[PDB]
Amino acid sequence: ACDYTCGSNCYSSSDVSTAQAAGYKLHEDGETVGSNSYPHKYNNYEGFDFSVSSPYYEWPILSSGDVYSGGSPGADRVVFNENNQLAGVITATNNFVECT
């Protein structure tokens, strides 16, 4: 169902756990993909109230259901921490708002 609503895009908790696992795996290998080299630290300058502690890492979640593997990241991102805990799902307005 829509556990997370990012504008036009509805994501289930299952869609989120698949994206997060691909981002965490790369984070553990010290590997990055794309121009902007994701996953990368997310500093939470928006001051969102996450349930888990930082440091935070951001990885793109794609509306198509594909796994991010380069090119355009789109507007949505999964935020997770160093302990592979999900902090939240955000969407762009560089500047973001939380998904509902």
Swiss-Prot record:
Keywords assigned: Disulfide bond, Endonuclease, Hydrolase, Lyase, Nuclease, Signal
Active site: H40, E58, A92
Disulfide bonds: C2-C10, C6-C99
GO cellular component: cell septum; hyphal tip
Enzyme Commission number(s) of this protein: 4.6.1.24
Key word Iron-sulfur present: no
Similarity comment text for this entry: Belongs to the ribonuclease N1/T1 family.
UniProt subunit comment: Monomer.
Stated name of the protein: Guanyl-specific ribonuclease T1
Protein's organism: Aspergillus oryzae (strain ATCC 42149 / RIB 40)
Residue span relative to the full protein: 27 to 130 of 130
